[PDB]
Amino acid sequence: TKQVSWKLVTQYALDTKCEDVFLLMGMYLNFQEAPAACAACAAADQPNHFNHHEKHYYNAQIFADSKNQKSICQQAVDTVAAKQRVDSLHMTREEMLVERFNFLLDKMDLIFGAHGNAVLEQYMAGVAWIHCLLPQMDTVIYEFLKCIVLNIPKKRYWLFKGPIDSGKTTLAAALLDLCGGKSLNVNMPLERLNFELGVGIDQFMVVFEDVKGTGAESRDLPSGHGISNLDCLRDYLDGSVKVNLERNKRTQVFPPGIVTMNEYSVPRTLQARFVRQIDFRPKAYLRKSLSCSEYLLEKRILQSGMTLLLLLIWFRPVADFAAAIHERIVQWKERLDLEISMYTFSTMKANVGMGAPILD
């Protein structure tokens, strides 16, 4: 009888960075039909399918007849986790950011391509709104990337503070997506904390999202254990030494990142853990401009790492990006130039400032 190549299934999982045994199984089974008569290959809208179908066709036919499908996929997924362990220890943090930028650029090549449905001008409208959120915004994002890549002890965490719908949640979500990190909830009691902190294993960056304090009920702010919990996690935030994380599973320097919170009282000991604090104040023109440009909210553009990378490609020269992605940055600069100019971009920012629709 024909033998299935476990190595080839693993190669597919490695090429697509697949961490889900069931997703892998389903995707691999979808390669068993003839690629010449494959409608998914003709549509060319799913690269994880159309770029691999021909290569995996004969192996997928054998896989379809297998009595050990889950085990083949478990070894493949384990190899992906094994590669991630090797990279977390050998890859430089700049190489880690290049890998994430390449993932975002692959997604951008698709959604703004011939077989995609995204509108590039709508994402550029988001770029204009984001550039209006803070002064020197391209420098804010660039200096955040430097903070994450350099990973300097005591200079690794930024604090985002402000009320609801102030751009604080949005910017933190977009920066998380740009770097490719994980969000954490520390509003739970200390008993469940260690399992939640374990989510940061092999992660590039993290966001401690919507951290709550106590005694702010008189200002309509909810009570939580967040601020108290974070104040007892100095070694995790500082990154001077390795911490023991469990989900024990790994001993590593806890990832850098962001803490987001409303207007709670910050203890002196927790305040000292942040190299920078950004205060987010709601601006009437930002909300108005957003209400007039609904596509931004509907298509989740403002929370996208692709929007922040387009901002960077728009504002920053080729030399500001790592050498390994220079060719892709140049091709994206040519693409953006065809559709927007410094004059039309300036009009978009002027439209934001007036609380009018960003696109005329």
Binding-site residue numbers for Zn(2+) are 49, 53
Looking at 97, 124, 286, 329, which residue binds ligand 6JJ (CB under 6 A)? 286
Distances (CA, A) of 91 to 18, 78, 221, 324, 337: 19, 19, 42, 14, 34
Cβ distance to a copy of itself smaller for residue 7 or 326 = 7
Distances (CA, A) of 259 to 27, 61, 82, 224, 228: 37, 49, 30, 15, 13
Count of all residues that appear for the chain in the document = 360
Q: Which residues are annotated as a binding site for ATP?
A: 162-169
> From residue 15 to residue 44, what is the string marking binding to Zn ion with x (rule CB under 5 A)?
-----------------------x-xx---
Residue 324 interface partner, choices a copy of itself, Zn ion, ligand 6JJ, none, CB cut-off 5-8 Å depending on type: none
- CB of residue 156 to ligand 6JJ, shortest distance in Å: 13
Specify the amino acid at residue 190: L
143: contact with ligand 6JJ by CB under 6 A: no
Q: Rounded to whole angstroms, how far apart are CA atoms 312 and 183?
A: 23
Cβ count within 10 A of residue 136: 10
Q: Which residues pair with 127 in a beta bridge?
A: none
Using DSSP bridges, classify how beta strands 250-252 and 243-245 pair: parallel, antiparallel or unpaired: antiparallel
53: contact with Zn ion by CB under 5 A: yes
Cβ distance to Zn ion smaller for residue 41 or 111 = 41
- Part in contact with ligand 6JJ (CB under 6 A); list of ranges 66-74, 247-255, 286-294, 321-329: 286-294
The binding site for a copy of itself (CB under 8 A) comprises: 6-7, 20, 22-23, 25-27, 29-30, 46, 64-67, 69-70, 72, 75, 78-79, 81-86, 89-90, 150, 152-154, 164, 169-170, 173, 182-183, 187-188, 190-192, 199, 209-210, 220, 222, 231-232, 234-235, 240-241, 244, 248, 250, 268-269, 297-298, 300, 303
Give the max Cα distance, the chain. 73
State residue 310 phi and psi, 5-degree precision. -65, -40
Residue 134 interface partner, choices Zn ion, a copy of itself, ligand 6JJ, none, CB cut-off 5-8 Å depending on type: none
Burial class (CB in 10 A: 0-12, 13-18, 19+), 274: buried
Cβ distance to ligand 6JJ smaller for residue 171 or 340 = 171
286-310 burial: b if 16+ Cβ within 10 Å, else e: beebbebbebbeeeebbbbbbbbbb
290: contact with ligand 6JJ by CB under 6 A: yes
Cβ distance to a copy of itself smaller for residue 267 or 355 = 267
Q: Rounded to whole angstroms, how far apart are CA atoms 328 and 106?
A: 10
Residue 83 interface partner, choices a copy of itself, Zn ion, ligand 6JJ, none, CB cut-off 5-8 Å depending on type: a copy of itself
SS3 295: helix
- CB of residue 38 to Zn ion, shortest distance in Å: 3
Q: Where do contacts with ligand 6JJ occur on this chain (CB under 6 A)?
A: 165-167, 170, 282-283, 286-287, 290-291, 302
